[PDB]
């Protein structure tokens, strides 16, 4: 039970599965809680599998199996690296790291070249619409889509799990006041890299497979159609991304320090 | 067989059912031909039943029954007035004569107050969208919607079947060179009306129940997304409306002349 | 003019209106001829509107309007079905099809349970008297009343216009020597009925609204008081009913044969 | 006022006009009381003027005028002999003293030769019927008629006012115990009569012009149709006749005694 | 007996029959007294029946019968109106009210146009002579005749009994000091007359049938031939007329006053 | 340093590297100790890589790299599974699990079908000779070869590391006195197997990659040529195999018990 919490902790989703499993809750409630957390985790992982139906259920074998559009991909006790090697073939990333898949599925997708003027009309007067990726604030990207009575905004800053481990390794290496040890790690970083130099291991760690690369902000009802509030969710998602991406680089520095 | 042709002739649709029934065609082909003609007729009648699934099939009793969303409404041998009293309760007309129903069904409908600027975006970048009624060229109205990969434009000039019989009665009455008989019909028109004066009967005539009030122009593929060609179909539908509405007022003058 | 003749032909009354209209007769004579024929027709139709003052007059609009106790009910050019839907609310039929109205109006009505002994006294010694309905010869009924110096006898065999069309349809269907076509009409008669099977239309036909259901035999002077001659008019009315009802079922078979 | 009471006292009708005139009642009430009493008096006088509309009204000249079908006949202050000479020409008596007029007016009248069997039918099943005169119990006569919802029975024993004065004169003359005076009146009765002998004068007396010759018993509602109760009113009228005719011969003996 | 006194009191003749009947006088004396009084009454009544032999006799029936030239006219107990209707057909009055009959009978009658000079010769030297009517003093008339040794002078002022009742009614009506009641009787006199207004009845009164209209003064012996004394009897008769006619209008005012 | 001891402990070779690294010994001595232990371990692992020159040396990066015929295969800190996936492609196992490679290399190899008579001659009179695999005592196999002045005997009982983990799992599962839990593990063993049932993980354990499958007994000098002593080393190697294979199945039961 605690392994799924650490697997859901790499996306900013507090599942409380270890507390819900001990809460003596029925299987119908446990399955719904584990399913609603992996969906909020898949939206923060940047996998771009929104077109897939993510689900989770506990097996009678004493394990938890992941579900994707009907077919089982992997199990919980099979390690955090087995699930990453299962959703990777179902994911298509471009040269920037974004998902080329459309969240709505088969249909039309407006390009990222569309001005903000034509977007307010598709937010106030349209039914179903999906946009591609466009350059956001700073070095980030953003995409929007609306399905049914719910509007979704996914501001993303692509960053792989390996690149995330190398960034946190250079932060703890630069914070070394000992100039002799800081030079020794800088000499080994020229060949093995920033990660292999600080270590002179983390294959079972969940942070080495899934990282935070996007944020999903939702809106339903009449707010999902007002163009003024849509401009307030893109900043609420870009700020929830800077805080989430700023907290994972700090939790990773507390582990590689040893 | 010939009754369905006259019933389809009041909407500008040449069904050729009397030629197809004598063509020794199978029932599968006869049902498809009668179904594709009533759909093109319902779109030219102005009933606004586009949200309903119109169908037609020949019965083993030797008759033809009309179909609407599964439930049979009326039969062909039951007269052209029985079908009009069946689709009227399923139709909702405002004070102008237009259908308040949305062609797409449940969802959002952009109002007729939207400028043409926000419409090109919903034609070039949107998936499913439907508009309400707006004032068109002259004294006409227009509405547009797109379902799947097909875009539909329905320019409409509301005119009931009774108002159509009264207009054709004043045209033949004004064309009377005999000033004495023209004055006599004008004296009886002050009470009985323009129709009851020329007649001093047409309950079994199909033109007294269904009239032309709109035109349906369709486009599929990439043409259903280009905003330049969408501006060419609205005029192709408004011209196909002036010609169709101009030919029904002439065929009605050739009958009331007797 | 010819429409009122066919409307008066369904009751065995030869009005000769088409010959009287062309006879260049004044309006006073034309109104009296059309009025005396509808009264003799209403007495043979079984409507039981004898308590109402039936009248008819030609309108200056080129039409003929029916009159009943002062208020206009319908017009001639309004079809033979409009007049039937107008006199029906003024008619009250029991479970047998007879008129519950008293021909004399407000007063006393002797029941049909009265013997023939007490009737001769009311025929020879009474002034105004009216009887209710009693079972006549065969499956018929009979009623008698006397107003002023005129005695009236109305032998009736109730039969609606729809039941009359179904009886004539089974006679032409039984006369089919072709056993294959006779079986085909018998197979469709199990659901649509005897009328809908022979037809695989007659809404404008006058025979589909008014049928012969009674006969009115009158007597005035001293003959309207002799009990011996009153027994001779009831048979003269029951025989004039079998012949009239036997001729309408033959004229209806000559139309449905096509 | 008191003269109309004595004029109404010769028919067994207590009018109480002298008490009603002093009762300070309006003219509308006084006219109705005097009218309802002369009608009940005319029915007991045997005049047979039931076909005439009897009425009475007080004149502004201080007198009371009699009314019959609209035209004034006589006045009250003109003596009781003037009214008798006015209704006599409007009365037609046969050789027996009965009124040949029919109470119902123009129409049919069943003869007195009709058995009681055919009468119960005309009482239970008929509307309006009137009978002629037939020999009743003893030396009396009887006639019946029904108008509207009221049945009337008039048992009559014809007796003129002059014959009534001669009968009461022989009763007081036979009651004379003095054989000498009884013989003297019998000797003068051989020429002058029974009346002129007892007197050796009464022209102003109301009893010398109007006498009781019939009785009117009425019934309304459902009782006016039951044959069992009709047999109870004929005896209630024949007994009310023997008592009324037996009391007038006693009041006349109390006057001629002087 | 007292009825003949009141019948003789309307002519100024005091018969005293009620005193003579109680005087136990024989029938021969009673007949002579009643005969001599009716003759003096007929001469004062103005009936002009002097040519008739007036007589009166009491009947054994207890009544008194009037006699005129042998044939009985009426009886006393038959009322004072029966005798007036009996002597009227035997009387012939002109337009002035005088009797056209000659008192002497068949013969010659000198006209009223004769001067007084030729009259003295017919009074002093003639035997039997009779004059017609001539205008007397004032508005009166006079006539003279002589039969045997008796000369008769009849000064007359014609006045019917009805006109006498109307004159006495205007005298009591004019003597009304109450101006309101005098106006009320004057308002009813415009239609009913002066008699019917004061009464708002007197058919049995003798004054309503016989009135004083002449006076008979007689002379016999040598005085019936002296012309000087004949001029003294005409004034003695004209004065006995003004007093008698002046006393009847006073006795009539004492009766109508009630 | 301690990881290479656990990596050398799965072959019955006590390297004492953690004690030699802390012994402050030079790199020349540390490299020789780590090299002589992996060679004695590769001979007990059954890999059949005797034809390859196995070597080991500590890297200046703080790690230990494995060496095989000159080319580096893997490193020590790369896990015990990386080295197993490196020597597997250099190993060729038949259907029984034995190495098809000849220990001497290119040359001739006497088959296992050779009798023991012809083997004593090749042990007492030959120089270089190598034998293939032949069925040994029980279910084991054996092979012999001599290179230079040293004779080698390798008695082998093929058993993969996965089959070794499944055997130790059935021993701890059969030793369960709790019959309910023993039945539950037997129910899950029908599908997941004996290993997956006891666990309801050991990827980083060295015992899950390298197991004991053979024993290498050596002899040099004149003893490497006496046929009597060669028969004493094959039993000294088959007994050193039963003890080594009997001690690894006991150390594996002490780990899977948790």
UniProtKB/Swiss-Prot annotation, chains A, B, C, D, E, F:
Protein activity control: Phosphorylation increases DNA binding affinity.
GO molecular function terms listed in the Swiss-Prot or TrEMBL record: damaged DNA binding; double-stranded DNA binding
Alphabetic keyword roster: DNA damage, DNA repair, DNA-binding, Phosphoprotein, Stress response
UniProt GO BP: cellular response to desiccation; cellular response to gamma radiation; DNA repair; double-strand break repair via nonhomologous end joining
Effect of residue 59 to A: Strong decrease in phosphorylation. Lack of phosphorylation
Applied uses, from the record: The PprA protein combined with an immunofluorescence technique can be used to visualize radiation-induced DNA strand breaks in mammalian cultured cells, allowing the evaluation of DNA damage responses. This detection method could also be applicable to genotoxic tests in the environmental and pharmaceutical fields.
Effect of loss of the gene: Cells lacking this gene show a reduced growth rate, do not exhibit a decrease in the efficiency of natural transformation, but are much more sensitive to ionizing radiation than the wild-type strain.
Post-translational events: Phosphorylated by RqkA in vitro. Phosphorylated primarily at Thr-59, and to a little extent at Ser-99 and Thr-131.
Modified residues (Phosphothreonine): 59, 131
Modified residues (Phosphoserine): 99
Reported impact of residue 131 to A: Slight decrease in phosphorylation. Lack of phosphorylation
Entry's induction text: Induced to high levels following extreme ionizing radiation exposure. Also highly induced in response to desiccation stress.
Role played: dsDNA-binding protein that contributes to the ionizing radiation resistance of D.radiodurans. Plays a role in DNA repair and genome reconstitution, and is necessary for recovery from severe genomic fragmentation as a result of exposure to severe levels of ionizing radiation. In vitro, binds to double-stranded DNA carrying strand breaks and stimulates the DNA end-joining reaction catalyzed by DNA ligases. Thus, PprA plays a critical role in a non-homologous end-joining (NHEJ) pathway for the repair of radiation-induced DNA double-strands breaks.
Name used for this protein in its record: DNA repair protein PprA
Organism of this sequence: Deinococcus radiodurans (strain ATCC 13939 / DSM 20539 / JCM 16871 / CCUG 27074 / LMG 4051 / NBRC 15346 / NCIMB 9279 / VKM B-1422 / R1)
């Amino acid at each position: 039970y605690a392994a799924f919490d650490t697997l859901m902790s790499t996306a900013g989703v507090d599942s409380q599965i270890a507390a819900l499993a001990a809460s003596e809750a029925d299987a119908g409630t446990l399955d719904a809680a584990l399913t609603q957390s992996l969906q909020e985790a898949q939206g923060r992982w940047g996998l771009g599998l929104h077109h897939l139906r993510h689900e989770a259920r506990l097996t009678d074998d004493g394990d938890i199996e992941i579900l994707t559009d009907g077919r089982p991909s992997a199990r919980v006790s099979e390690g955090f690296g087995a699930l990453a090697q299962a959703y990777a073939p179902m994911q298509a990333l471009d040269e920037r790291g974004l998902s080329q898949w459309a969240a709505l599925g088969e249909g039309y997708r407006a390009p990222g070249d569309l001005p903000l003027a034509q977007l307010k009309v598709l937010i106030e007067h349209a039914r179903d619409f999906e946009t591609d990726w466009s350059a956001g604030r700073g070095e980030t990207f953003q995409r929007v889509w609306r399905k049914g009575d719910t509007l979704f905004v996914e501001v993303a800053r692509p960053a792989s799990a390996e690149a995330a481990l190398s960034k946190a390794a250079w932060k703890v290496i630069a914070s070394i006041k000992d100039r002799a040890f800081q030079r020794e790690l800088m000499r080994r970083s020229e060949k093995d890299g920033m990660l292999g130099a600080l270590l002179g291991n983390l294959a079972q760690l969940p942070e080495a497979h899934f990282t935070v690369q996007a944020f999903v902000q939702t809106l339903s009802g009449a707010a999902a159609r007002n163009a003024e509030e849509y401009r307030a969710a893109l900043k609420t998602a870009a700020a929830a991304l800077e805080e989430y991406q700023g907290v994972t680089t700090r939790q990773l520095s507390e582990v590689l320090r040893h």
